[PDB]
Every structure is written in C-alpha cells, then in structure tokens.
Amino acid sequence: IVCHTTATSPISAVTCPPGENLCYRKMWCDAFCSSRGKVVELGCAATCPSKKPYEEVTCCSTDKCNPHPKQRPG
C-alpha cells in the first residue's frame, strides 16, 4: 500500500512503511470552496480520528490517495 511523494511533485523514493497505516492528507478548502484548495501537506499518521467539523486532514488509505495541484481549474 504505497503513496507517491507528497507535495509539488510526481516522484522521489516513497512508502508509508513499518506500521501503521494511512497517507494523512491535509487539504485546506476554505468553505464553499467553489474552485478552491490548492493545498496538499501530508506526512503519514498511525490512525483515522481526523474526521471532524473545520478540518483539512481526513485520513488517506487504500492506495496512492495523492491528487495533484487540484486546479485543473476545470
């Protein structure tokens, strides 16, 4: 179960590895947010209790959860 690198980028040398878990992705999204975000962050967690009212982090399991610069504005 393998994330990409993160932030700016397509590539480097990857894996969230020994345990535990999930590619913990912060995404700003001001409200609304209509065409808004352009904010990654991520540096892995052990656990999924990020799920709350004014967050950002949601947990990021399964694969590469990783988007882009969201902005494919489209």
Partner: peptide
C-alpha cells in the same frame, strides 16, 4: 523588515523531471 509570507502551501509548479 518583512520575512513574512510566503503563501499557503501549494502543490503549484512541479518539481521537475525533464
């Protein structure tokens, strides 16, 4: 003065491979 800002926080303008 200033130092300072900066953004954000954007994934804008990748990395690049090339």
């Amino acid at each position: 003065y200033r130092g300072w800002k900066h953004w954000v926080y954007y994934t804008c303008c990748p990395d690049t491979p090339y």
